[PDB]
């Protein structure tokens, strides 16, 4: 039928960035008309693809990844970036082909007194490879003494809360992000405009 973009975009819940959600889009026609011609997006940037041309193309599969970050971090959802999000939460490859879409969701995802449901990974020994998803909750060992599952000095829970409050500045407000990857394989195409 029609590719179920609404299930992704108009979803009541969104994932924390460290456990970002991925929907696989196959065997349907995708019209990007609603997305490119909606005035409700803070960010709509495409790489290796032009948005108008999207309805004139065909891919093996499309991937829709979804999560929440803060505004100042949306710039890290792009090829070749660095920072806590790009390094330890969600990493785009340098040859990325697809589009990043983001919109302010302060009305949905912020709570007076702090919304502590949305998390980000703060500690990680090494960088993420592109499209890697790390859901570990092992205690982070910042020294040479083993932590053994208990928090303490040099032994920290690797995930931290954003604590979105509606009073935050726009750079610290939650933004919902959808990353569309258009994958080109040597196989029959199943997603078209």
């Amino acid at each position, epitope marked *: 039928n029609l590719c179920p973009f609404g299930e992704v975009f108009n979803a009541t819940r969104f994932a924390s960035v460290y456990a970002w959600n991925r929907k696989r889009i196959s065997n349907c026609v995708a019209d990007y008309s609603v997305l490119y011609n909606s005035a409700s997006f803070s960010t709509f940037k495409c790489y290796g693809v032009s948005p108008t041309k999207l309805n004139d193309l065909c891919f093996t599969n499309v991937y829709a990844d979804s999560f929440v970050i803060r505004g100042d971090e949306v710039r890290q959802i792009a090829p070749g970036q*660095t920072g806590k999000i790009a*390094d330890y939460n969600y990493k785009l490859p340098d040859d990325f082909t697809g589009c990043v879409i983001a919109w302010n969701s302060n009305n949905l995802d912020s709570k007076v007194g702090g919304n502590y449901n949305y998390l980000y990974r703060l500690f*990680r*020994k090494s960088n993420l490879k592109p499209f890697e998803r790390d859901i570990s909750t092992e205690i982070y060992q*910042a020294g040479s003494t083993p932590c053994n599952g208990v928090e303490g*000095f040099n032994c920290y829970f690797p995930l931290q*809360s*954003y604590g979105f409050q509606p009073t935050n500045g726009v750079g*610290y407000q939650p933004y919902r992000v959808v990353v569309l990857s258009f994958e080109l394989l040597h196989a029959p195409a199943t997603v078209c405009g």
Partner: antibody, heavy 118, light 108 residues
């Protein structure tokens, strides 16, 4: 047990070069957010540079293209390579460990003095 | 560039009085990313408060912190002779910037 000790400070001329070292004990440099913060005589604290556990580095605008932060995991040591020094780089340079929301900058060295003069 | 401005520049109090230091960020920042540090002459800074109100290890109970949005406050409930020093606020949510500092004076 927890100690940061800075070395390498001294007197140098404008346009000169110097490499500061910060030896750590009680935690692993490569496992942490490690920063240099400087304080000019009589003024406040100015962050200089940071290196993430994963290798990413960031710099203050006032040192971009002149300073480079790095580390040696074998000697558990952080380094600041400073090129094209100017008179305003004259300051005490501290090396510090940051925990962000998990506890701020909780460990500081005692600093090393760098004087840049003609 | 987030600019932190502290007030007042100098605070003059006696041992046993209450100290109230204010810090204003030029842009709204989460209380998650606010810290307070103490510095005495010739010594490195020492972390007092992280995450706007969490005391660091070893920090006595007279030190408290609060605030949100652009305004934050460090409070020393009853001042000890050790408490006469300079105090800096810091945001660490977008790299790091400090305030110019507030000095606590011995009043007379």
């Amino acid at each position: 047990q927890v100690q940061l000790v800075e070395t390498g400070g001294g007197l140098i001329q404008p346009g000169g070069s110097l490499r500061l070292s910060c030896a750590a004990s009680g935690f692993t440099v490569s496992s942490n957010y490690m920063s240099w913060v400087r304080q000019a005589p009589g003024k406040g604290l100015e962050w200089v540079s940071v290196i993430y556990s994963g290798g990413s580095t960031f710099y203050a605008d006032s040192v971009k293209g002149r300073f480079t932060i790095s580390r040696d995991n074998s000697k558990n040591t952080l380094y600041l390579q400073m090129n094209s020094l100017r008179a305003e780089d004259t300051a005490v340079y501290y090396c510090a460990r940051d925990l962000e929301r998990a506890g701020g900058m909780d460990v500081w060295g005692q600093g090393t003095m760098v004087t840049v003069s003609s | 560039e987030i600019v932190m401005t502290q007030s007042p520049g100098t605070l003059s109090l006696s041992p046993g009085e209450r100290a109230t230091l204010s810090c204003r960020a030029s842009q709204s920042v989460s209380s998650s990313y606010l810290a307070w540090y103490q510095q005495k002459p010739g010594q490195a800074p020492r972390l007092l408060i992280y995450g706007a109100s969490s005391r660091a290890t070893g920090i006595p109970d007279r030190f408290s912190g609060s605030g949100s949005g652009t305004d934050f406050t460090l409070t020393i409930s009853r001042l000890e002779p050790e408490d006469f020093a300079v105090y800096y606020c810091q945001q660490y949510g977008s790299l790091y910037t400090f305030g110019q500092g507030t000095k606590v004076d011995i009043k007379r």
